[PDB]
Structures are given as C-alpha cells and as structure tokens.
Design a protein around this ligand. Structure first.
Ligand SMILES: Nc1ncnc2c1ncn2[C@@H]1O[C@H](COP(=O)(O)OP(=O)(O)OP(=O)(O)O)[C@@H](O)[C@H]1O
Ligand SMILES: Nc1ncnc2c1ncn2[C@@H]1O[C@H](COP(=O)(O)OP(=O)(O)O)[C@@H](O)[C@H]1O
Ligand SMILES: [Mg+2]
Ligand SMILES: [Mg+2]
Lengths: 539, 114, 421
C-alpha cells in the first residue's frame, strides 16, 4: 500500500505505487532519508508511477527506498502560533525556538477564491514615499509589484515598505521570502527582532509577523512552493480570523524560475525564452489567491526580478496583469543617484483615476509625468547642443523637470546604514503640495540639487539656505590659528605611544582541535555483502 | 559465457531475444522443440482474448501478469527454456514481442538447417 | 567492466593539511609532495548555513585594490562577483586579494587571519603553475590552497571542483577562522556542467544549458556566509569570476550569478585600454553590503570620492568640446580626472588600507589640484613615501581618522613635495 523510489534524476523523483496511486499535489514522505525529505506529486506517469518534485535535496536516495503517502498536500501550521516564527516550505521551524503550536494544519494547495467573493473597493495606501504616493499610488487591499533588475533597489524598497506600512498597521503580516539571499533574510529577521515586530519567548503572541523562507540554496521544489506556504499563512488570517493581512513576497520571479528548473525533467518540452509551457497558468494559480475577498484583505507587495532589466521577458511581463500598482525601478534612474530608482514614466496604478484620488492629486501627477516626458523628448537636443538653442521656450520645462527628478528622490530609514542621511516619511498632502509647487513655478528660483535627497518642500528650502551658508565658507578655512599642530592636537610621535601593541603569534592555531583521519592510499569499495574491501586486482 | 554462435547476426531487442533463445536451445539441442513451443503460443494468442489481454492492456498489474503466466506453465511439459522465457517477458511486459521473436527465431532455425 | 560502489557520497580531504597544496577537483594532490597528511574526509555537497546560523556582515576584507576598498567595499562573508570580458583584470583582482591577505596575516592575531582558496576551473596547467610560482615567491602559499581542475581534466572534475574548493574552505568557516574562496571561471564550471548534463540526455534549455544551472551556482555561492557567535563567528568570502562576451551581461550565467551574489565588480575592456587599471566600471559596480563593511576613515573619504566621480561621469559625454571653459563643470572634470588617475594601480602589489585611505584623502581634500592629470601615479607614490610612517601606525590602530590626526597629516601633506606645478 506504500510506494518505492523508481528513478532519481536530480531534484525529480519517480515513485512506483503497487495499487492506489496518490493524487496529484499529494505530499509523500521518503522513509529512511537522513534529513526529512518530502516529495510532492506532480503527475501520474502512467505505469503505476507518480513523478514528484522534492522539497529537499535527493542525494542519498536509493532506488527502492520506501515512500509513504500522506494522502493530502503539503500541510503547514497556521494561526497565531506562527507569528514571530520562521517557517520552512513544509512548515518546519528554522528559527530554533521549538515546535510550532498550531491553530490548524492547512493544506498549501487551494483554489483561488471565486468571482462572487471579490471586493471592488479601492482606497489608497499611503506609504510615505514621494514618487509612490504621487505617480503610482498603492491600493489598500490590492496587489503591488516592484519590478527591477538585479541591484536597483527592490529589496531596500520592500524593507522601506515593511517599516513604513506594516509597522503602524492593525493586522498581521507575512513575509514570504521566495528564493532570495539568506544573508538578507537573516538581516530582515534581526531588523524585526530589534524593532519589536517579532518578539521572542513569552512575548511571542505579541509578534505581528510570520516569516516563511525558501531561499536560494534550497532545491527548486522548495522554492516553487514556499510562496504557496506563505500565502497559506496569509489565507488563514484572511479567511478564518477575518482581518487585514500584509503579504510581502520578495522575488516572485523565483517561483517561476524554480518551476522552470524542474519543468524539463517533468517531461515538458520548453516554451519560449526557456521557461515552462505552464508559465502563465502557474503564475495565475498562485497570484489569483492573493486577493482581497469579502472576508478579509491581503494587500500584497511583490518584488519581481526583471532578468537583465529586460521587461519584455515572459516572467516579468506575465505578472504585470496580476497587479494593481506596478513600481518599475530603473537602472537609468539609479546611476543618476536618485533613490528610490522608480521610473516615473513606467510606474502605473489603478488608483490613478480622478474618481478615486481626486482631481487635484491626479492633475499634479499627470503634470509631473507630462513635464518629465517632454524633458525626455528634449534630451536628444540638450545632450547634443547645450541648452542655448531653446531660448526659454522649453527651458523652463528642463529647469522644472530637473527639479522634479531630484524631488522624486528621497532618503530611506532602512538605507541610513548605507546613506549618511536619516530617513524621511512624507505625507500625501505634503508631497502633492510640494510637486504642485514645482510644476507651477512657485519654487523656480531655488538651486537644482537642493531638491536631491530631501524630505519635503520645507526641506528643499532648509537645504537651500544650508548651501547658501556653505558656499560662503569655501573662501577661508585655512589659517587664523585654526588647523595648526598645537591648536588642539598633540605631537605626532606621542600618538604612536598612545596606541598599545596587539600580540601576534604566526603559529596560526589550526591544529588546536583538529581530529584527523588516516586517508586511504588506495580506493576502498563494497563487495556484494556490503563490506569495505579494497579494490580487487581483477581489472 | 560459452554459448554456440548464432547462424546469422540480426537486428535489435527483438531478434536479440530470438538469438539468445536460439543460443540456449542449441546447448540443450532443443532447437526444434521450442520452435514448436513458440508456434503453439501464437495459436494460443489467436484463441483466447483473456490471454492477449496480458500483452496489450496496460492496466493489468505486473504482478498479475507474472503470476498467470507462471500459474499456467507449471505443467504440460513445456521446455524449461520457454517457461523461463515467458517469465522474463511477463516481468517486463514484453509479451507482445513473441510475434516478432518467432519470426526472428525462424530464420535462425532456417540458417541452422541451411 | 565491473563497477563497485564505494558507499560514499563524494568526499574531499579538508583540514589544516590542505594549506599549501595544489589539489585537483577531487582532492588528490598534484604538486608532487606526497599525500595529504593532516586532514579528514568531509562531504562535497553540504547544505548552506541557515538563517539562524548567520550574523550580519560587519568587518571588512581588504583587497588591497584601491578601487574596491573605496568604491566596492567587501565584507567578511559576502559574495562579490568579478564579472568582465577576457583579459580585463579579473584574475588580477583575485590574486591581489590573496596576496594582500598574506600581507595582512602577519599583522593580525590568529583570530583575524584569512586563509585563501583558489579554485581554477577550466584554465591551463601553465597558468595554474604560474600562479603557484607567484604565490610561493610572494609567500602566499602558507595560507593558500589551490584546487585546480584544468582544461584537460574531465567535465565532472571541473563541475565538482568549486564544491571541492568550497568544502576545503568551509573548514575555516566552521572552525571559527576566516576563509576567502575564489572560483576562477565559474562560467567554465557551467560549461562543464552543461556538457555533463547534455551527455546524460537531460533536456537542454536556454543556450543549451540545463534547467538547474541556477541551482548549480546558488547552492555553491550560498555556502559563503558570516556565521553567528554560537557557531564560531567564522566567515567565508566568495569571489566568483564570470567572463562575458563583449560586455554582454545579459547572458544566462552572467544574469544568474549577478542575481545570486551580493555585489559585482564589473570591469570593462574599454576602460582597460584607457589606462584605467584595474578597469573598474564605477557606475555598474555595486556592493550590497554597502558601506556597512567599510574601513572607517576610508568611509570618510569614500562618499566624497563616489560623489565627485558621479559628477565627473555625468558632466562627461560633453568633455569632447574642450573649447568652452565653463569653470564650474571644468573644475569637476579635472577634479574627477585627479580621482580617476588616483585609482590606477600596478598589479601584484596590493596597498595596505592605511596608505589607500591616505592617498584618497590627499585627493579628496584638494592637495593634488596643482599636479596635472598625467602625473599622479608618481605623485601618490611621493606622498606615500614622503609622509612619516607613523601616520599609518596610528591610522591602522585608531580605526578612523581621529581629530588628533586629521590636522597632523593636514600639515604633513603640505610639507612634502608633489611632482607637478
Ligand atoms: N592593474 C593592472 N595593472 C597592469 N596590468 C594589469 C592590471 N590588471 C591586469 N593587468 C594585465 O592585464 C591582463 C589581464 O589578464 P587577467 O589576469 O585579467 O586574465 P582574466 O581576464 O582574468 O582571464 P583571461 O585570461 O581568460 O582573460 C594580464 O596580462 C595582466 O598582467
Ligand atoms: N533608497 C536607497 N538609498 C540608497 N541606496 C540604495 C537605495 N535603494 C537601493 N540602494 C542601493 O542599491 C543596492 C541594491 O540593493 P538591493 O535592493 O538588495 O538590490 P535588489 O533590488 O536587486 O535586491 C543596495 O545595496 C544599495 O546600495
Ligand atoms: Mg534582492
Ligand atoms: Mg582568468
């Protein structure tokens, strides 16, 4: 009534079942593996064989190893007991805080909710970022996407959305780390331990976050399903407890990439760029579950990798239709130094109706986009000729758009470990008034790089007068007994005795605890009875 | 190991069965015996439909196929090569190959009688 | 032929007995100095240490290359890609990084030392023998292992050699010491894996690579970690090297390893022939540890150096028209020229970090504005060899440029002569 392993090709195992095959998506437990290996049935191969993807690595699987069916898909803990915990793809705790008490053990495989239970109520989500709240305002209850190539600032932007939105928020949050660096997963965990979002020990009930981690080291079976596991933890909060959940998925691209890593071994001939034929339908089967129903709401922020900043690739370009507000981060905004490197002429929102955010916000956003697009048109002249063939016809659009480009930049509180500038949180009315002031001409006398990396429109004047101090200090800072060798400092050789010497050994301390092993000179094999004999001389 | 060489070389995986079936029946000097035994199954597959179900229907279990071929061939004085042959094909589901082993067993028998 | 199973998943000898030896991709020593003695057999494919087993990357790993300790700073435990074209300076940056750890291991206690591992996949035996000769002449072989799967070796050996080298380097990560692993030509490891998987009849994908060529590199590069203090506080710093084809970083393996690693050191074949050596593209070179893993004092000059280089890059593409002197852009252009000429560096001689931050402080505070563009590489050497050597002895000890020191060398930088009027 159990199954045995028939075939192992990398991360894909075929299991042979004498009678009563498991259903597709069922989880299978390999009996006798060193680490706990779970397979998930992907297809019925035809000859009493199921073909499965493994949630851990398959090195150490023997053909004929017993595989026991569990009769159900991958089932994870859900509820309040997962708050403040780090979960595996199969719900194992990997935070070393002991086992997970569970309100329930829900399957990770589910249907998308229905069409009748859909919630068409658009209200804004003020995030505190200037370019986001101006040009692509996020929807409280909607799906948000952060597109960008490698190294443009999606991870920093989603940390800023964690401490800017999920901090002062009523409901709980789930972070589904799907195939990203484990260094930044540990960094997020520590930055939420010391922030009070996750509280350890006895205050664990007062934690307001669940981490589910499927990071880059793991096999593609784990990375393909960790997004489903984190979505299961969020769907429990949406359905059963009925509240407003925040689901931060870092790198939803990795879900599709891990599907395509096993898809050729699952017997599917490849589609275009190299992805699986079932690319859009896998993406949809995940993404249609992350929805605000009438029970609760899941307002999700999904980072999307865009491979070599090519937005026409099918894995970024397929998930555009699943989002309400797309935040396209660009490299060309980034090497101008503008952070967050949000492309203003590529970031869209369904909250950019005049019916929804009102007309006096929409007109500011449309005027900003108009001014920046006309500057993009003029850049094929004013990078060639030199702004002396415009004669103030379109040159106030250049001088306005160059201030608008720097005014979209903003320091981040999570990026103060990079940037020597404390972070800012801008209100929505403040950034509306500030960008209206630049696009009308209320602030057309200021310097240009007074706008760069400031909070709001009071701070551009607070930086303008600071530079109008420090332009005057660039004529005399040398003498007047002000930087001399006995004004405020001791002698040079006394400081060499002020420091004290550290001790160096150069015996390097390697063999302090090392337990060696007498290596075999010749190779040693197993005989038919399984015993370690030397290699026989019959060649 | 040390088998008598086949009278003529042949194709793949269905004549290689019949070459090996000829090569062990020659050491037993039962070349005309199993050529009669192979022919009797071809009329036997013509008679019964529940027997050629074990060679075409992909839903019979591979346990029930290998038990029925053994449970029939316990008796009748069929040669021990063929009742070892039919258990090799029933374990692998290669019972359909018997119609192609027989036509490849024929020309080995024809080039042995020259 | 008879095949006997050994009952073992693939092992390598790890331990202190591998330091100094030249091994192949399966661990057997090829330097002709007998078998490996003071070692034990550990696995090749281990799981990378998890979320709890890590801590934040704080302490720096000085390369000695001036353009990466200032612009692309590298911490103990991060993965920094060296991506470029052919003959642009990738192996040069790697070799400087190893030679500098030799120069640094003599001045630090045994809990601060870095033991280097160089994995040569798909190179010649002549190039590897040349590197071993170089590391013995410098003295780096008492800290360096070399795992060389050369081009004549089988494709499974070139596929398994980064994992072999990383397992020999994980002994230092796991015993509380510090490691530096350099997988030279990780593209060649991907090519060997593609061959090994196309002959096993696994269905190809993009550029005929397997499906799991991302997992091939992610499960290797994730083993470079900074561990927590419960597990010893050890570190493993990985420097994968990816060769591109005419600057195409949109290729499959290039995008995969750009996606995996923290930073990238992008070198250009157009900057290489402008005389800028190491040929670092200062725009596209990122380090996602940030300045959190930078030497203090170098951090005090590095934001300024980055900012003026960012201005010098952008007011260029107009510098062809040298006719119209603008006197605000032109100062920025020749100041960035001073800074760009500053970061040039001859190879096989890594600089100590104190001399690097003094040489960048002497250019970001304007001491070198008198000297022309073309003669700063002698001016910086005059500055380094003409200041007192007691400036560095307390800049290294104090960790940062203290107020009792930034006015000492403010006067020391004026009492020296600079070769230029
Ligand atoms: N900073 C430098 N100063 C002077 N010469 C350099 C410098 N960096 C590299 N070179 C020279 O440029 C060439 C660069 O070759 P390198 O060692 O980079 O090979 P590679 O690009 O890593 O790999 P491949 O040989 O496959 O291209 C070498 O001849 C080296 O001596
Ligand atoms: N708001 C910001 N301020 C300053 N630097 C930033 C900002 N956002 C991103 N960066 C820089 O860009 C790099 C990209 O980091 P990360 O977000 O991890 O990349 P990715 O978006 O590819 O995950 C960071 O190391 C940081 O140096
Ligand atoms: Mg990232
Ligand atoms: Mg090289």
């Amino acid at each position: 009534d159990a199954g045995y392993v028939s075939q192992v090709i990398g991360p894909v195992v075929d299991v042979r079942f004498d009678g009563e095959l498991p259903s597709i998506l069922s989880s299978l437990e390999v009996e006798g593996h060193s680490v706990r290996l779970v397979l998930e049935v992907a297809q019925h191969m035809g000859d009493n064989t199921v073909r499965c993807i493994a949630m851990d690595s398959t090195d150490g699987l023997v053909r004929g190893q017993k595989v026991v069916d569990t009769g159900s898909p991958i089932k994870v803990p859900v509820g309040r007991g997962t708050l403040g915990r780090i979960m595996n793809v199969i719900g194992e705790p990997v935070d070393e805080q002991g086992p997970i008490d569970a309100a329930d053990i829900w399957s990770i495989h589910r249907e998308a909710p229905e069409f009748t239970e859909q919630s068409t109520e658009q209200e804004i989500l003020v995030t505190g970022i200037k370019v986001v709240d101006l040009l692509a305002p996020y929807q409280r209850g909607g799906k948000i996407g952060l597109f960008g190539g490698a190294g443009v600032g999606k991870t920093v932007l989603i940390m800023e959305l964690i401490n800017n939105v999920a901090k002062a928020h009523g409901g709980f949050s789930v972070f589904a780390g799907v195939g990203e660096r484990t260094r930044e997963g540990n960094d997020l965990y520590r930055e939420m331990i010391e922030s009070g979002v996750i509280k350890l020990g006895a205050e664990r009930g007062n934690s307001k976050c669940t981490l589910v981690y499927g990071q880059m080291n793991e096999p593609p079976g784990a990375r393909a399903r960790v997004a489903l596991t984190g979505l299961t933890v969020a769907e429990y909060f949406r359905d059963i407890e009925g509240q407003d959940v925040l689901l931060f998925v870092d790198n939803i691209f990795r879900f599709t990439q891990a599907n395509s890593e096993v898809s050729a071994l699952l017997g599917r001939i490849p589609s275009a760029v190299g992805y699986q034929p079932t690319l859009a339908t896998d993406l949809g089967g995940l993404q249609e579950r992350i929805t605000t129903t009438t029970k609760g709401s899941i307002t999700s922020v999904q980072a999307v990798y865009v491979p070599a900043d090519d937005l026409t690739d099918p894995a970024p370009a397929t998930t555009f239709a699943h989002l309400d507000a797309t935040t396209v981060l660009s490299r060309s905004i980034a090497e101008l130094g503008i952070y967050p490197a949000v492309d203003p002429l590529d970031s869209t929102s369904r909250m950019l109706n005049p019916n929804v955010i009102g007309a006096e916000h929409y007109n500011v956003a449309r005027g900003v986009q108009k001014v920046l697009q006309d500057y993009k048109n003029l850049q094929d002249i004013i990078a060639i000729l030199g702004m002396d063939e415009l004669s103030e016809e379109d040159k106030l659009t250049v001088a306005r758009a160059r201030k608008i480009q720097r005014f979209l930049s903003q320091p981040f509180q999570v990026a103060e470990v990079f940037t020597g500038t404390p972070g800012k949180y801008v209100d929505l009315a403040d950034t509306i008034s500030g960008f209206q002031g630049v696009l009308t001409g209320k602030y057309d006398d200021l310097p240009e790089m007074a706008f760069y990396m400031v909070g709001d429109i009071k701070e551009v004047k607070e930086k303008a007068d600071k530079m109008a101090k420090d332009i005057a200090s660039r004529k005399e800072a040398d003498n007047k007994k002000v930087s001399e060798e006995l004004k405020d400092i001791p002698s040079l050789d006394k400081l060499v005795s002020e420091i004290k010497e550290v001790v160096i050994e150069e015996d390097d301390g390697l063999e302090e605890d090392f337990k060696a092993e007498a290596l075999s000179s010749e190779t040693v094999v197993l005989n038919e009875e399984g015993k370690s004999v030397p290699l026989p001389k019959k060649n | 190991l040390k088998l008598p060489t086949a009278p003529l070389q042949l194709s793949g995986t269905s004549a290689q069965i019949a070459t090996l079936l000829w090569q062990v029946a020659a050491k037993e000097n039962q070349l005309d015996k199993v050529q009669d035994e192979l022919y009797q199954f071809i009329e036997l597959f013509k008679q019964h439909s529940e027997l050629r179900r074990l060679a075409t229907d992909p839903f019979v279990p591979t346990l029930v196929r290998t038990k029925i071929i053994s449970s029939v061939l316990k008796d009748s004085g069929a040669s021990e090569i063929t009742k070892k042959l039919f258990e090799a094909l029933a374990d692998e589901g290669a019972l359909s190959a018997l119609l192609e082993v027989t036509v490849n067993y024929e020309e080995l028998m024809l080039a042995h009688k020259k | 032929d008879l095949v006997y199973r050994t009952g073992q998943i693939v092992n390598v000898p790890i331990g202190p007995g591998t330091l100094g030896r030249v091994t192949d991709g399966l661990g057997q020593p090829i330097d002709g100095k007998g078998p490996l003695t003071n070692v034990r057999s550990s696995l090749v494919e281990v799981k990378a240490p998890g979320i709890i087993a890590r801590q934040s990357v704080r302490e720096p790993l000085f390369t000695g290359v001036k353009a990466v300790d200032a612009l692309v700073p590298i911490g103990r435990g991060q993965r920094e890609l060296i991506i470029g074209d052919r003959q642009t300076g990738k192996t040069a940056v790697a070799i400087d990084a190893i030679i500098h750890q030799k120069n640094c291991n003599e001045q630090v206690p045994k809990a601060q030392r870095v033991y280097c591992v160089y994995v040569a996949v798909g190179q010649k035996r002549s190039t590897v023998a040349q590197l071993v000769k170089l590391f013995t002449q410098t003295g780096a072989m008492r800290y360096t292992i070399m795992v060389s799967a050369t081009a004549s070796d089988a494709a499974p050996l070139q596929f398994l050699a980064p994992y072999s080298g990383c397992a020999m380097a994980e002994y230092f990560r796991d015993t509380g010491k510090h490691g530096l692993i350099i997988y030279d030509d990780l593209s060649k490891q991907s090519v060997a894996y593609r061959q090994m998987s196309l002959l096993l009849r696994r269905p190809p994908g993009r550029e005929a690579f397997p499906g799991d060529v991302f997992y091939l590199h992610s499960r290797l590069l994730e083993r470079a970690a900074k561990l927590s203090k419960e597990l010893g506080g050890g570190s493993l710093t990985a420097f994968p090297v990816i060769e591109t084809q005419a600057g195409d970083v949109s290729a499959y393996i290039a995008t995969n390893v750009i996606s995996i690693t923290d930073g990238q050191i992008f070198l250009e074949t157009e900057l290489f022939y402008k005389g800028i050596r190491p040929a670092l593209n200062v725009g596209l070179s990122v380090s996602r540890v940030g300045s959190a893993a930078q030497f203090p004092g170098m951090k005090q000059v590095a934001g300024t150096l980055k900012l003026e280089l960012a201005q010098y890059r952008e007011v260029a593409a107009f510098a062809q028209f040298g006719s119209d002197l603008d006197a605000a852009t032109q100062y920025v252009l020749e100041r960035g020229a001073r800074l760009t000429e500053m970061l040039k560096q001859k190879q096989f001689a890594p600089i100590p970090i104190e001399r690097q931050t003094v040489a960048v402080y002497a250019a970001t505070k304007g001491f070198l504005d008198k000297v022309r563009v073309q003669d700063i590489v002698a001016a910086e050497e005059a500055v380094i060899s003409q200041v007192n050597p007691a400036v560095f002895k307390i800049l290294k000890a104090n960790g940062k440029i203290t107020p009792a020191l930034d006015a000492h060398l403010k006067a020391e930088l004026r009492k020296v002569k600079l070769p230029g009027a």
